[PDB]
Write a protein that binds this ligand. Structure first.
Ligand SMILES: CC(=O)N[C@@H]1[C@@H](O)[C@H](O)[C@@H](CO)O[C@H]1O
Ligand SMILES: [Ca+2]
Length: 217
């Protein structure tokens, strides 16, 4: 039941679910949602809301798609902005970003809190202090920005960043990170339109794997 069920992946870890995989949790209003738990990385108990690995899924999508979520439990997905809001509203959730390049190097970044607002406030990013990690910091520059898609420009640029740059993000003018960008497979000649984390590999290298995930702080 909702009353006795888990609220997130940390609750499931505490109950002795030790393998990563898809589990049912209960959101604050008791709506059930199936989510990917990362039980292995950095203590486990992370709820994963973004995953890229192979370029099989098109991420250049509209507001409605990002609002409801898209992709596959078997592979790449975006969990959905309504879902991410519900998951991060109550309490305080830390954020971890996990990255792998095409040369096999693992890199990460961690933030002390992470929340997205509701749709009325355009799923605005509310980001806490950078903790550290080998990937460096490419998200703080996005704090307090609305989410934007190609069809809904909420950025702080005279341009359309989502169109520029071929992704969906809390764009400013325009970005330091672009993890929902094109799956460009390592070095690319086009500027800043790949799966880029500029603090680590810059604006002209697209990562092999990207994962974004949250856990109670
Ligand atoms: C790819 C991209 O958006 N790079 C921008 C750069 O063009 C801009 O001059 C600067 C202003 O703060 O912010 C960077 O993030
Ligand atoms: Ca704009």
């Amino acid at each position: 039941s909702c009353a006795t069920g888990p609220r997130n992946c940390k609750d499931l870890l505490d109950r002795g679910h030790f393998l990563s995989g898809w589990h049912t949790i209960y959101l604050p209003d008791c709506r059930p949602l199936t989510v990917l738990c990362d039980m292995d990385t950095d203590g486990g108990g992370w709820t994963v809301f973004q995953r890229r690995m192979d370029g099989s899924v098109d991420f250049y999508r509209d507001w409605a798609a990002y609002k409801q979520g898209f992709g596959s439990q078997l592979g790449e997905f975006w969990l959905g902005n309504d879902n991410i809001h519900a998951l991060t509203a109550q309490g305080s959730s830390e954020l971890r970003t996990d990255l792998v390049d095409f040369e096999g190097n693992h890199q990460f970044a961690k933030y002390k809190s992470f929340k997205v607002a509701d749709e009325a406030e355009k799923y605005k990013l509310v980001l806490g202090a950078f903790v550290g990690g080998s990937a460096g910091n490419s998200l703080t520059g996005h704090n307090n920005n609305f989410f934007s898609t190609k069809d809904q420009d909420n950025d702080v640029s005279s341009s359309n960043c989502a169109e520029k740059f071929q992704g969906a993000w809390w764009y400013a003018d325009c970005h330091a990170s672009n993890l929902n960008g094109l799956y460009l497979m390592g070095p690319h000649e086009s500027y800043a339109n790949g799966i880029n984390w500029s603090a680590a590999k810059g604006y002209k290298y697209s990562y092999k794997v990207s994962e974004m995930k949250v856990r109670p702080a």
